[PDB]
Each structure stands twice: as structure tokens, then as C-alpha cells.
């Protein structure tokens, strides 16, 4: 891979996009999508500290 | 035939001259980057093993 | 049989045999002539232009 | 972890079995080699002076006339479609 | 002009624009009109996205699923992978050029543009540049002129009016600063910086001692 | 040591960084000692 961005930034971006796509496809229930989104928010906030 | 002391009689200065001639009429940055390696090899220090 | 100098940056002795005296015996020598090597490179370029 | 060779053999006799149907398709080159060999026909052996010339030959019974870049693009499209990038 | 952009925008917008502009190897202190254009672009796109969701059935929702997915403000790699993922999951073929955002209710990539000039000229320019018929196009104007494909406004009238007012007030603020007339937008010329590799400092000194005996500097030997 | 010219990832950038480091007046290193 090539990129100036840090690991966590690309990781969280990919996580959000994949989560949204998977939920849209209907392969995952709403509870799992909400939980992964909450954990992604947790990761983003911990990234700052 | 075979060449004796191949790596002892080759001078980094001569490689610098060869690289300078090869890179004639070329951008200055390219000549510099290509010719720096012989310069570094000319002023080289060797560690004396473990002891 | 070369030129002894003292590096101004590392402060270490350095030996420069380029353009040194031509060999007088068959023993190994490090006295490579700049003009001869440049001539060889030029003739190589001529034989294989470009 | 650090394991003994015995473990491997154990897996080969007590490990979980899984279906293996894509393997002939995925490893298509090797199975092409074996299938070609099994159907070959041999002839007489001629004892005579052999003159061998050193030449550049292509060792690839199966290839689609692709270089490294094109092959990489196709492989990315098939295996990693989401990571292909700008290429079309 | 720089300080105005920094202070009259949300920190996220300025940070994203600065990172994206740096990602191309250009110094922000040099280019400001491009910086202003990209930051305004990010602001307008975020407003075009913020405060629109999709309910369970799949109708409009205004304060959950996000109706608009943003593509700008990201590295080439991230943007391209999201474009590919959306194209593969939904079915709409991806375009040769990077769009601006994507809507799931219409399941289509929509372009967003904000420019001082009239809507018609830039609309024609973008249409003939992207050369796309399956991607929605939306062009706004600093003076309120705004139009989309077949005059189809995806956003509700209230949202469009809010975005137009935001654009007008930012334009008024730049005019108050006095540099509005000297902004005139900008376009990416893809300027190529000449490669430079110079031998200076201690290295140069070393280069001066790595020559045959009858020379005193690298320049003379060269 | 405040030498971040190689962030681009290009080898030539790393060479520029090496030259700049050689131009530095002082260098800082980290050493591990166990006692």
C-alpha cells in the first residue's frame, strides 16, 4: 500500500465504509452495525489520546 | 586468465571519473546522485573485526 | 607511491594513487591513469553510440 | 507457539476434514501438467548424437499473453476487486 | 485570505483540506485560492450530506443510516476503494474520474460544484470533462444560481436555500475582507516541480577530496 | 533528530535526508543497557 495517512485513519475509514456497505447488503442485523459503529467512534476518540 | 587483487586495486576515484563521463550532458541532480556513491566509498573506514 | 592527504572532515589519512608513477614491475599496482580510463570510456561510447 | 512434527501428522489423521473442490481449479497449472502427462504417448528411443543449442524458450504451456502489470491488474480485479483502484 | 479560511470554517474542514492539498506535494503557504476553493467545496458537500438520513422503509429523514456518502477529503486510495466498493455492492458502474459524493436513495454518484462563474459554463465544462451520463451533476453559484441534471434537485428546497445562503454569506465575508474580486477560483494545473539534488555542506567538502591529485574541486573535474 | 524528508517514501528523498543528517552538527542515538 501507498499513503501519507497514518494506520488508524485508514483503518477507521475502511471500517466505517465496510460496515455501511455490509449493513446495506442486509447480511448483518442492526444491532451489530450499531455496536461496530460505537466501537469505531471509541477508536477514533482514543486516537486523539 | 584471472585478475589478482581485483578489489584492492580498484579506486573509487576512477569510478567517480567513469560515472562523470557516462552522465555527460545530463541534469545536475542526476549527476550528483550518481556520483555521490564513489565519493562516499573514497572516504571509507573499515572496522577491525571483533578483536 | 601515491599522495598522502589528511581528510578535513574525518581527520584521517588518505592515499591517492591516481595519476601516480607508471608501474616499473609486474607486481600489482593501483596507479590508474585518469586520462587512459576516460579514453577507454570515450572509445567504448564510440563503438556503441548512444 | 512451538510444536513438534507429530502434531502435523496428528492433523493429517485426526484433523477436521474440509471439502476440496476448488483446489484443482485454483492450482490449474499443476493439474494441467499431470493431465497432459497421463495422456501422452511414447515412442521408440533413438540412440544418436544429440546437438543441443542454448536458446531462450518460454516455459508456460498456459499463458494469456500478459506482462507483470496486466497480470497484476487482472489478478487484483478477480481476487481483490474492492482494492483495484482507478484501473478499468 | 488564509486566516479567513482558517477562522471562518469548522476545524475539520480546514484540517481535511490542508491534508488533501499537502498530499499532492504542494505547500499550503503558496496556494490559497485553491485552498479556499477546496475548503468551500468541502463545506458545501458536508452541508449537502449533513442532516439527511434514511429510515427503515427507505424514505426521507431529517433531524441512523446516512443518505449521502462523501468521497472528497480523502486520499486517492481511500476514495478509489470506496468508489469501487459502492459500484460493486449497488451495481452502478464506477466512473473514470472520481465523483464527489453518492446517494443511496437514488443509488447514484452525484457531483457537487461551487464556483463564482455562471452555472451554465461550469456545468458544460464538468459535463464534457467527466463524460458521464449515469452520474448526477449539481452546480451552485455564489449569487444563488444553481442547477442540476434535467433541473432535478435531489435536496429539498429548504436545504438548497440553506446552502445558497451559506455560500452567499461566505462570499459576503470574503468581499468584506476585500479579496473577493481577487479570488476568481482556481483550477488544478498539475504543476511539476523540477527535481533537484545538490551537493552542499560537509558532503561537498568530501567531494572536493575524492578526485585525482591534480584537481581541487568537483566542479573543475566535472 | 528532526529529519523527516523521507516521509514521502521515495528513495531519493531518503538520500536527501542522509545528506542533511551528514550536515547536522550533532546526532542523538538511543542505547539499551541492562543492569
Alpha carbon distances (Å) from E131 to B17, E117, F21? 54, 21, 49
Distance between start and end Cα atoms, chain D: 44
Indicate the residue of C3, C8, C9 with minimum beta-carbon distance to E213: C3
How far away is chain F from the Cα of A4, in angstroms, using its nearest Cα? 7
* Beta carbons of E213 and C18 less than 8 Å apart: yes
List residues of chain B with CB under 8 Å from any CB of chain F: 33, 36
CA distance E105 to E68: 9
- How far apart (Å, rounded) are the C-alpha atoms in residues B50 and E14? 56
Touching A: which chains, 3+ CB pairs < 8 A? E, F
Q: Which three cell numbers stand for residue F18?
A: 542522509
This PDB structure is determined at a resolution in Å of 3.2
**CA–CA dist F27, A44 (Å, integer):** 35
Residue by residue, DSSP assigns chain D as ----HHHHHHHHHHSPP---SHHHHHTHHHHHHHHHHHH----PPP--------------SS--S--HHHHHHHHHHHH-GGG--S--
- How many angstroms separate the first and last alpha carbons of chain F? 27
Residues 6+ apart with CB under 8 A from C36: none
CA-CA distance, E151 to E174, in Å (whole number)?
Answer: 29
Taking each helix axis from N to C end, the angle separating A7-25 and A30-48, rounded to the nearest 10 degrees, works out to 170
For the beta carbon of residue F31, count every other beta carbon within 10 angstroms: 4
Alpha carbons E131 and C37: distance in angstroms, whole number = 59
Which of E206, E212, E213 is opposite residue C9, by nearest beta carbon? E206
SS3 of residue A46 by DSSP = helix
Q: Cell 591529485 belongs to which residue?
A: E213
Nearest to E207 by CA among D81, F21, B13, B22: B13
CB neighbour class for E169 (10 Å; exposed up to 12, middle 13-18, buried from 19) = exposed
Residue E66 has φ and ψ, to the nearest 5°, of -95, 120
Cα–Cα–Cα angle for E84, E87, E88, rounded to 5 degrees: 85
Chains E and A share 3 or more Cβ pairs within 8 Å: yes
Are the C-beta atoms of E110 and E82 separated by less than 8 Å? no
d(CA D73, CA D81): 10
Rounded CA gap, D86 and E8, in Å?
34
Element (H, E) at E219: helix E218-221
Is B36 within 8 Å of F15 when comparing Cβ atoms? yes
Identify the helix (H) or strand (E) that includes residue E66: strand E65-66
User: What crossing angle do the helices spanning E76-90 and A7-25 adopt, rounded to 10°?
Assistant: 10
Interface probe with B: pick from F15, F16, F20, F23, most Cβ of B within 10 Å = F15
Hey, CA dihedral for E81, E92, E119, E141, is it positive or negative?
negative
**Taking each helix axis from N to C terminus, what angle separates E157-177 and E33-49, rounded to the nearest 10 degrees?**
160
Judge residue E104's burial from the number of C-beta atoms within 10 Å of its C-beta, 0-12 exposed, 13-18 middle, 19 or more buried.
middle
H/E element, A47: helix A30-48
- Nearest 5°: CA angle at F33, between F29 and F34? 160
CB atoms within 10 A of CB B25: 5
- The C-alpha atoms of residue E23 and residue E41 are separated, in whole angstroms, by 17
| DSSP notation for E77-110 | HHHHHHHHHHHHHH-PPPPSS--SEEETTTTEEE
Contacts of E37 (CB under 8 A, 6+ apart): E185, E186
Put simply, the answer to whether E205 touches C9 (Cβ < 8 Å) is yes
Q: Do D and B have ≥3 inter-chain CB pairs under 8 A?
A: no
The number of angstroms, rounded, from the C-alpha of D42 to the middle of its chain's C-alpha atoms is 24
Cα(E145)–Cα(E151) distance, integer angstroms = 12
Say whether A3 and E77 touch across the interface (CB within 8 A): yes
Q: Which chains share 3+ C-beta pairs under 8 angstroms with B?
A: C, E, F
Give the span between the Cα atoms of E144 and E167, in whole angstroms.
8
Q: Does C9 touch chain E (CB under 8 A)?
A: yes
By CA distance, what is E201's nearest residue in F?
Answer: F23
In angstroms, the CA F35 to CA F24 distance is: 32
**Contact between chains at C18 and E212 (C-beta distance less than 8 A):** yes
Q: How far apart are CA B2 and CA B4, in angstroms?
A: 7
E55's grid cell: 429510515
Give residue for cell 568530501: E206
Contact E85 A17 (CB under 8 A): yes
Question: Cell numbers of D19, please?
Answer: 471439502
Bridge-based pairing of strands E108-115 and E136-141 is parallel
| Half-sphere exposure for D11 (CA within 13 Å, toward CB) | 6
- Contact between E163 and E140 under an 8 Å Cβ cutoff? The reply is yes
CA nearest to C35 within chain E: E212
Asked if B4 contacts C28 with a C-beta cutoff of 8 angstroms, the reply is yes
For the four alpha carbons of D61, D66, D69 and D73, in that order, the dihedral sign comes to negative
DSSP E103-156: ETTTTEEEEEEEESS-HHHHHHHHHHHH--SSSEEEEEETTS-EEEGGG---S-
Q: Determine, for residues A2 and F9 on separate chains, whether the beta-carbon distance falls below 8 Å.
A: yes
Among chain C residues, the shortest Cα distance to E202 is held by C9
Amino acid at each position: 500500500p501507498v499513503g501519507i495517512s497514518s494506520m488508524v485513519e485508514a483503518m477507521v475509514s475502511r471500517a466505517r465504509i465496510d460496515a455501511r456497505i455490509d449493513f446495506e447488503s442486509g447480511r448483518i442485523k442492526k444491532e451489530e452495525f450499531a455496536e461496530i459503529m460505537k466501537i469505531c467512534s471509541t477508536i477514533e476518540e482514543l486516537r486523539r489520546q | 586468465g584471472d585478475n589478482t587483487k581485483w578489489n584492492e586495486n580498484q579506486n573509487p576515484r576512477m569510478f567517480l571519473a567513469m560515472i562523470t563521463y557516462i552522465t555527460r550532458n545530463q541534469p545536475e541532480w542526476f549527476r550528483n546522485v550518481l556520483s555521490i556513491a564513489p565519493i562516499m566509498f573514497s572516504n571509507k573506514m573499515a572496522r577491525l573485526g571483533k578483536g | 607511491k601515491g599522495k598522502w592527504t589528511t581528510n578535513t572532515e574525518t581527520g584521517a589519512p588518505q592515499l591517492n594513487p591516481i595519476d601516480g608513477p607508471l608501474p616499473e614491475d609486474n607486481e600489482p599496482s593501483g596507479y590508474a591513469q585518469t586520462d587512459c580510463v576516460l579514453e577507454a570510456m570515450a572509445f567504448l561510447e564510440e563503438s556503441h553510440p548512444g | 507457539v512451538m510444536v513438534s512434527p507429530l502434531a502435523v501428522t496428528w492433523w493429517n489423521r485426526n484433523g477436521p476434514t474440509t471439502s476440496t473442490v476448488h483446489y484443482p481449479k485454483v492450482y490449474k497449472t499443476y493439474f494441467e501438467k499431470v493431465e497432459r502427462l497421463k495422456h501422452g504417448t511414447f515412442g521408440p528411443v533413438h540412440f544418436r548424437n544429440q546437438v543441443k543449442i542454448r536458446r531462450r524458450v518460454d516455459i508456460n504451456p498456459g499463458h494469456a499473453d500478459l506482462s507483470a502489470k496486466e497480470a497484476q491488474d487482472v489478478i487484483m480485479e478477480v481476487v481483490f476487486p474492492n482494492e483495484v483502484g482507478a484501473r478499468i | 485570505m488564509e486566516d479567513f479560511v482558517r477562522q471562518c470554517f469548522n476545524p475539520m474542514i480546514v484540517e481535511l483540506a490542508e491534508k488533501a492539498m499537502k498530499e499532492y506535494g504542494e505547500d499550503p503557504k503558496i496556494e490559497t485560492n485553491k485552498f479556499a476553493s477546496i475548503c468551500t467545496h468541502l463545506e458545501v458537500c458536508f452541508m449537502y450530506s449533513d442532516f439527511h438520513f434514511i429510515d427503515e422503509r427507505g424514505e426521507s429523514t431529517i433531524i441512523l443510516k446516512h443518505r449521502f456518502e462523501i468521497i472528497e477529503g480523502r486520499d486517492r486510495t481511500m476514495a478509489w476503494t470506496v468508489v469501487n466498493s459502492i459500484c460493486n455492492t449497488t451495481g452502478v458502474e464506477k466512473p473514470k474520474f472520481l465523483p464527489d459524493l453518492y446517494d443511496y436513495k437514488e443509488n447514484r454518484f452525484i457531483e457537487i460544484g461551487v464556483t463564482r462563474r455562471e452555472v451554465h459554463i461550469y456545468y458544460l465544462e464538468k459535463a464534457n470533462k467527466i463524460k458521464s451520463e449515469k452520474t448526477h451533476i449539481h452546480i451552485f453559484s455564489f449569487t444563488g444560481e444553481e442547477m442540476a441534471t434535467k433541473a432535478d434537485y435531489t435536496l429539498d428546497e429548504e436545504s438548497r436555500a440553506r446552502i445558497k445562503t451559506r455560500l452567499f454569506t461566505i462570499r459576503q465575508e470574503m468581499a468584506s475582507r476585500g479579496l473577493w474580486d481577487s479570488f476568481r477560483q482556481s483550477e488544478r494545473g498539475e504543476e511539476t516541480i523540477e527535481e533537484r539534488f545538490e551537493i552542499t555542506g560537509t558532503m561537498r567538502r568530501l567531494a572536493d577530496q575524492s578526485l585525482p591529485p591534480n584537481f581541487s574541486s568537483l566542479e573543475n573535474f566535472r | 533528530n528532526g529529519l523527516t524528508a523521507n516521509e514521502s517514501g521515495r528513495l531519493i528523498d531518503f538520500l536527501k535526508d542522509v545528506m542533511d543528517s551528514m550536515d547536522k552538527e550533532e546526532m542523538e542515538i538511543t542505547t539499551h543497557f541492562q543492569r
